Swiss-Prot record:
PANTHER family with a match to the protein in the record: NUCLEAR INTRON MATURASE 1, MITOCHONDRIAL-RELATED (PTHR34047), PROTEIN YKFC (PTHR34047:SF8)
Reverse transcriptase domain mapped to chain residues: 67-308
Cofactors: Mg(2+)
Application of this enzyme or protein: Mobile group II introns can be retargeted and used for highly specific chromosomal gene disruption in bacteria. Could be useful for genetic engineering and functional genomics in a wide variety of bacteria.
Protein name stated in the entry: Group II intron-encoded protein LtrA
Protein source organism: Lactococcus lactis subsp. cremoris
Domain of life: Bacteria
Misc. comment: The correct folding of LtrA seems to be facilitated by binding to the unspliced precursor or intron RNA. RNA would serve in part as a chaperone that promotes folding of the protein into an active conformation. Purified protein lacks endonuclease activity unless complexed with intron lariat RNA. It may preferentially function in cis by binding to the intron RNA from which it was translated.
Gene Ontology molecular function terms on file: endonuclease activity; RNA-directed DNA polymerase activity
Family statement: In the N-terminal section; belongs to the bacterial reverse transcriptase family.
RNA sequence: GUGCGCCCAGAUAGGGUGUUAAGUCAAGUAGUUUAAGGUACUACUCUGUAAGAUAACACAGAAAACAGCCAACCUAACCGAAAAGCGAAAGCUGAUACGGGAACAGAGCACGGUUGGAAAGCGAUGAGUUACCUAAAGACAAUCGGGUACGACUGAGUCGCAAUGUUAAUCAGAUAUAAGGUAUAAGUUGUGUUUACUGAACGCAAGUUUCUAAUUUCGGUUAUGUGUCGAUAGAGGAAAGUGUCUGAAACCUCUAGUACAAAGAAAGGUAAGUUAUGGUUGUGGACUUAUCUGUUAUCACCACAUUUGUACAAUCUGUAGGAGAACCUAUGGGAACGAAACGAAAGCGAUGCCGAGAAUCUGAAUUUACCAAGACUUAACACUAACUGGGGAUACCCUAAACAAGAAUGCCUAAAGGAGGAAAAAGGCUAUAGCACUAGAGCUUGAAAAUCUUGCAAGGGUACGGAGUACUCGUAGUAGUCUGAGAAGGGUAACGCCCUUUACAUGGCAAAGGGGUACAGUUAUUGUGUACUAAAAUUAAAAAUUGAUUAGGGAGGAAAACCUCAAACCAACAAUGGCAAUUUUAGACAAUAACAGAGCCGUAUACUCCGAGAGGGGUACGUACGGUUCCCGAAGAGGGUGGUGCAAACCAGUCACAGUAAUGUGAACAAGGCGGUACCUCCCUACUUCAC
RNA sequence: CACAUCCAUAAC
């Protein structure tokens, strides 16, 4: 079992100071242990979790390994490796998976380990937030609309998290709250094995077929620990930046950034210099276009998919700042998903879906609907209904033109306007399309 | 696998087109007028003027037939069928009988015909089943205070446009490749539109098209309307504008949604320019230009929304770079900063191709000055189709023809006798129990007339919808001097074009649908290549040696300060050494089966729709013959070689039982035979809808 | 600040 790793991270040579916490995880320390014994050591067969939405086929130990895996069944566990990353259908912090080896079922538990290890008192917002809470896309609304009484949001381009992975100070940091000074080593002899194959003998990965569940949280540690070190100067940075523009809370994602608080471009040079120093020194990656693209006040320019202002024109601001659903993406997949054409003026138009021959009709409406519902979270807290309403008109008339050009009678757009949908009152029926669409608009937006 | 389409002959079986011999047909009424000539003019009646009401004249017209819509009825044709029928039968065969009856597309072959002027369709709504709200803020109340076009919601009354087009009028000639407009493919992939491909055909040249706007509220707002916030704009607004009171001196409509000026400032209606498009090409609403007989008579105007001139404003009006948020410079509200979609494009040029008003200016032009072409009918001819007429291999379903067939029955008294003593299984013979049998079962019975059987000849149907390259097949007749030509050609273009010489009979086709033959191309399976020649990013190269290397041990149980449990180590940076595949240096390939239609370009023709006309959209890529890439159909249901278990039952002794054999047997998924449900199927089938 | 929509018919 993982009893080794139990004795490893639990014990952690605690005769002098030890695994991360120093006053606040003593009677909260075995909090993990008791239940990792019951959850991360769920059971010895097919038990913990897996990939058929709970776990794969039901074998006996998990198949045979973990009990004696103390004796390192897959000792080296070479785990052949290539690269992979998929453009997440919007606002991609593109997420990594691992080439299929049901050692998968090993690493998933092996990293529920690390999840419960660091996250429990410390590591905040698994998979791209900043502050600690128990949800995915919540800081990236609330902290945005929490403070920010300033201008000059500083975007970020270079990855530094994946195409610059350390692999030396990587472990050097990983073992700063897991393994101890004395008698703790037995983990990473395979963690080091992102042996990518692109005509070289690299150890660096771009997707670490070692596993996909963890590479998010590995990257998250990569950034998360040392964001404290780089925040240590932020800890005195806002002497007057909050209080210079005044007279009448970092921004940590997986990938992209902006400095929290601004008072001056001279108050911004400190960013421009230090946040380049540390990232250079520690991360072994360096940033782009001279700290970046520093907007004077505002732009219709992206950030994690969300603009911030500090006929596609309904923005606001004032004494207080806010959020806005910008253009780019709904110029990008608005056009690649074959919603619009601009090649007739009167800017865009619902013309139809790409396919001449298309799938079934419940299929059509359902995949269209899920596409829309794609708005439901991403385009949550947002101004600019009428923009989205242009979007929605094009989308709806696209789905109706689609089910039209499938029936294909006499420009079946009219008879399909009339025969089902949301006014024909009909299974040939799905009355959720667009009222629920402006429902998803109104809420998660004003609440 | 689109209603038909195959390929070769003519062209009323029924037609289409073209041009010629013509005719007949109506032009509001007359007039000189030609001759039945024709809108020319004189007179006359009606007709139109609202281009924005009135009357008077000047101008635009007066019909007729075709096409063509529209509805309504009536009946061929097309229907499962009647109904007859042909080895019964697989399937075929509807004078007329229900149902449809314009059949969906007629866009290359018809329903046809009578009536009437009118249908879908789109904007303006009758009617019938809703919600608002209401100047006060509401409350109070359908108090019709004071309503419903804010609309429902459903189902159709009333108008509009569809609901008209089409036919000649005195003749040139002039800026006649003029500006404009068309073409040059498609198609694939480079996706940064940066000059690349295809066995394009063209030729020059990469940001072409669009848009980031409007000056003293067109401010806080869109691609509608709407309402509420604020700067300029309240008598009311608590003695309720029907009632009622309270809550503000704020709260409702409105203004102060420019300062004016300058001309127009309404409906429609006519033609265009578009928008409508969007995916190809035509008909209905929305915008712009302009047009809608001149003057006297009341009529005949307040507006109104917009150009222009700016006048200053307030939002803070891209830009370049600054720029506490009440921030600025400068070009100040395109003032290339750009912004986007946007790949041998746009743009540009060439060559080719088009030209009515006969542009506006001259000789115009003479019995109002010259006119013979709309539609039907008729003569003839050239032409043409998917029509009509001829021609039908290759693979399939079936029925008899004992045409040829593997198939004809038991025991006993006792082979004799036979069973012609006796039965009755056997084929049947019937119904029908029924899960096949068992057919039960008297019966002919003791072969026949029928397990099973593939077939002579033959009965029928499906395939005539183009994919890469030769050959058996029905024709070298049904085509003869092809147009893909013999045959030289010669030229040319992607070739096939285009035009010259030219052999008279197996030249030309060696007609079509369809198979396999042979290597191809692609999608699928197993296998192989994997040096015809070695090394290389080095994948093996965390190896080893490591480098003398680095803090770290076996299994487990406890917070952290660790406590218990039993009693020499593998990893830390790598180099390094072989090959493994193809990168990288070079004398994966086998075997299996199946194979379908997106076009586009030229030549000849068929049609239709849009257009001055070149041309663009269609008809299976129109259709065949040449070139080409792009591209390698889909499900469902029968069927049958073949399968696959599993409940029941099955029969004579397969088993038992006794009987003359049957006979009565209980016990058969001990299935001996043998089916019903069964599985994943196998393969075939345009089988039926789909994809074009 | 906002609510919401406005698009035919028909030739493959």
């Amino acid at each position: 079992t993982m009893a080794i790793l139990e004795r490893i991270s639990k014990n952690s040579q605690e005769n002098i100071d030890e695994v991360f916490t120093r006053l606040y995880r003593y009677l909260l320390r075995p909090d993990i242990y008791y239940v990792a014994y019951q959850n991360l050591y769920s059971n010895k067969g097919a038990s913990t979790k897996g990939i058929l939405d709970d776990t794969a086929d039901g074998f006996s130990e998990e198949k045979i390994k973990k009990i004696i895996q103390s004796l390192k069944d897959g000792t080296y566990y070479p785990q052949p490796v290539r690269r992979m990353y998929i453009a997440k259908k919007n606002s991609k912090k593109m997420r990594p998976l691992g080439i299929p080896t049901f050692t998968d079922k090993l690493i998933q538990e092996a990293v529920r380990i690390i999840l419960e290890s660091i996250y429990e008192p410390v590591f905040e917002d698994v998979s791209h937030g900043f502050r600690p809470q128990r949800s995915c896309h919540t800081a990236l609304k609330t902290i945005k609309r929490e403070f920010g009484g300033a201008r000059w949001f500083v975007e970020g381009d270079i990855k530094g998290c994946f195409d610059n992975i350390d692999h030396v100070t990587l472990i050097g940091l990983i073992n700063l709250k897991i393994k101890d000074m004395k008698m703790s080593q037995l983990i990473y002899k395979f963690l080091k094995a992102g042996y990518l194959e692109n005509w070289q003998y690299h150890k660096t990965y771009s997707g670490t077929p070692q596993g996909g569940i963890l590479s998010p949280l590995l990257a998250n540690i990569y950034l998360h620990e040392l964001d404290k070190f780089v925040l240590q100067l932020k800890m005195k940075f806002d002497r007057e930046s909050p209080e210079r523009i005044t007279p009448e809370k970092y921004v940590r994602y997986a990938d992209d950034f902006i400095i929290s608080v601004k008072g001056s471009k001279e108050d911004c040079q400190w960013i421009k210099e230090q946040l380049k120093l540390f990232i250079h020194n520690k991360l072994k990656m360096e940033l782009s276009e001279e700290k970046t693209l520093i907007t004077h006040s505002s732009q219709p320019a992206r950030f994690l998919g969300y603009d911030i202002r500090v006929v596609k024109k309904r923005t606001l601001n004032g004494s207080v700042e806010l959020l806005i659903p910008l253009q780019d993406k709904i110029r990008q997949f608005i056009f690649d998903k074959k919603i619009a054409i601009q090649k007739k003026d009167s800017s865009w138009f619902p013309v139809h879906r790409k396919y001449l021959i298309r799938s079934t009709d419940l299929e059509i409406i359902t995949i269209y609907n899920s596409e829309l519902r794609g708005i439901c979270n991403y385009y949550g807290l947002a101004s600019n209904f009428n923009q989205l309403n242009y979007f929605a008109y094009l989308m709806e008339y696209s789905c109706l033109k689609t089910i039209a050009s499938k029936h294909k009678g006499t420009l079946s757009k009219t008879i399909s306007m009339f025969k089902d949908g949301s006014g024909s009152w009909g299974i040939s029926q799905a009355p959720v399309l667009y009222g629920y669409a402006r429902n998803t608009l109104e809420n998660r937006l004003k609440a």
